[PDB]
Design a protein around this ligand. Structure first.
Ligand code: B5N
Ligand code: CU
Ligand code: CU
Length: 288
């Protein structure tokens, strides 16, 4: 309950400056790239081989994997500046806007704006604009700049709504067999966004576009972490409401998906990260 993770819209000018100031540093040192690679590596690690489940997505481990993923990044952030925590992008309230792209998160002093259609949707405003921020492709090679294209697809023309989030929180089971994209009455799958997809988490990625629109290159966009922080916040809320509901599967799931299994590419288990408070952080909405 030490580190407080704040709503992006609640950040001060200084807090925003410091966060962005801290991220380019991780990037400059070569630490940021470690996170891009981890995500891509886990995405291609199938549980079991030949299945469409992987270590980080389309399965039960989706939530704890990104929580650990998000946990590690923050610590790296703190190592540069102990006053800096990972904020979250409350995309459900942005969806209430007629044009979500006018949200403050996309201001030139924080995340920067939408892609330039003249430059094939390269981002040329903000701290992470092309020439300020180098990107890497699926194969781990330099790719030439961040891209974004808000609501440019028919499958996801809009961001998920507060109701979408509220309905997900109603689900009683954390997850259900066969522990994958096809799971029904499943909070993880629902939140992931595979129920009548794309919805929620998956919808956000699709909405943003650019690197965020594909699994192996999504972390190239710093907003990926703000996004998943919100996803993690939602999960945390679900945990506080359904206090006696626990992670599933406990056993007999694919290896890497069970409660006591190491979540590739780490040795961290879902168990090790079930309680968001034991990891040393809390969301601001828990204190209000
Ligand atoms: C194929 C499909 C089926 C259902 C819902 C969405 C989609 C889809 O096209 N996505 C493309 C964009 N990301 C991919 C993605 C997922 C998780 C990440 F950490 C990073 C990137 C979200 C899902
Ligand atoms: Cu992911
Ligand atoms: Cu994601």
């Amino acid at each position: 309950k030490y580190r407080v993770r704040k709503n992006v819209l609640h950040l001060t000018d200084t807090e925003k400056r410091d966060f962005v100031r801290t991220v380019l540093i991780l990037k400059e040192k070569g630490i940021y790239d470690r996170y891009i690679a981890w995500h891509g590596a886990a995405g291609k690690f199938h549980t079991p081989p030949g299945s469409d489940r992987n270590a980080a997505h389309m399965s039960s481990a989706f939530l704890p994997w990104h929580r650990e993923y998000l946990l590690r990044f923050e610590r790296d952030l703190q190592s540069i500046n102990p006053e800096v925590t990972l904020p979250y992008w409350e995309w459900e309230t942005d969806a209430q806007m007629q044009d979500p792209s006018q949200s403050q998160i996309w201001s030139a002093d924080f995340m920067g704006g939408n892609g330039n259609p003249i430059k094939d949707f390269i981002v040329d405003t903000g701290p992470f604009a092309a020439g300020r921020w180098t990107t890497i492709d699926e194969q781990g090679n330099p790719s030439g700049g961040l891209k974004r294209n808000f609501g440019a697809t028919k499958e996801a023309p809009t961001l998920p709504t507060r109701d979408d989030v509220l309905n997900a929180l109603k689900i009683t089971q954390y997850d259900t067999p066969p522990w994958d994209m096809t799971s029904q009455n499943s909070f993880r799958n629902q939140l992931e966004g595979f129920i009548n997809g794309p919805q929620l988490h998956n919808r956000v990625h699709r909405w943003v576009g650019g690197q965020m629109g594909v699994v192996p290159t999504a972390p190239n966009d710093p907003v990926f972490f703000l996004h998943h922080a919100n996803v993690d916040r939602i999960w945390a809320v679900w945990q506080i409401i359904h206090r006696n509901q626990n992670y599933q599967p406990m056993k007999n799931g694919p290896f890497g998906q069970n409660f006591r299994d190491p979540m590739y590419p780490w040795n961290t288990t879902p168990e090790d990260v079930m309680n968001h408070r034991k990891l040393g952080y809390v969301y601001d909405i828990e204190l209000r």
